[PDB]
Amino acid sequence: APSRNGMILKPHFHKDWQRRVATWFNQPARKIRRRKARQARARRIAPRPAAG
């Protein structure tokens, strides 16, 4: 029940949304993985440009 003067909003949380929560603790470890996979690429293509 709405109290007083306050914004009308429709929260999209009516599904089983808690099962499908994607938490970003992968993020700081992902940037290490993506960087080591980018340097070791560039070290293979030794005189070639690294962007390609």
């Binding site: 003067n5 306050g6 914004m7």
Partner: protein
């Protein structure tokens, strides 16, 4: 057994700023001393205004401090704001400006000083004028904040130009039944 209503006994002014920042708290100590030991009412207002919340000391823009200092009998006078002085980009001409403010935005500094203007602080304003003799005390707009457009009479109640709280404005976000004679009705 005295019939006094204790509803309106505790006054809701401020006795100190809620901010724990020391520089602003060292300034209060300097104007607590002046508010009481000077006959001036300038130092009463400046002390009272140092206590006030961010919303109560709004940013007075450069163009008002141009406008409200071009007035007659205001020449060779120092403009005092207890809020801040923000740079107004759509004003070209910038005179000499003796200005005291807690903060000035670095682009307004860049503007004021280059036009041979001097910027003081409230510690220097006391040394320049303890009683505040020859000072223009200003404030920015306090119905400035967009928050005030939602206040007053109810949006959905006749002769109210009140901004309603809508998720997003388009052609189908609160437009039909309360707003048109064609729909249910118009207020």
């Amino acid at each position: 057994g005295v019939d006094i209503l204790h509803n309106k006994d505790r006054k809701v002014w401020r006795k100190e700023p809620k901010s724990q920042d020391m520089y602003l708290r060292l300034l209060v100590k300097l104007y607590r001393f002046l508010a009481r030991h000077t006959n001036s009412t300038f130092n009463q207002v400046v002390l009272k205004r140092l206590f006030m919340s961010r919303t109560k000391r709004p940013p007075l823009s450069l163009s008002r401090v141009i406008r409200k200092m071009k007035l007659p009998d205001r020449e060779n006078k120092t403009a005092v704001v207890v809020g801040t002085i923000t740079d107004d980009v759509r004003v070209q001409e910038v005179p000499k400006l003796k200005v005291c403010a807690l903060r000035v935005t670095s682009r307004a500094h860049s503007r004021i000083l280059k036009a041979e203007g001097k910027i003081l602080t409230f510690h220097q304003l006391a040394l320049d004028s303890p009683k505040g003799r020859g000072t223009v005390l200003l404030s920015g707009p306090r119905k400035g904040r967009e928050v005030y457009q939602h206040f007053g009479k109810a949006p959905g109640t006749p002769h109210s130009h009140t901004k309603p709280y809508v998720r997003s404005k388009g052609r189908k976000f609160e437009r039909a039944r309360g707003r048109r004679a064609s729909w249910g009705y118009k207020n």
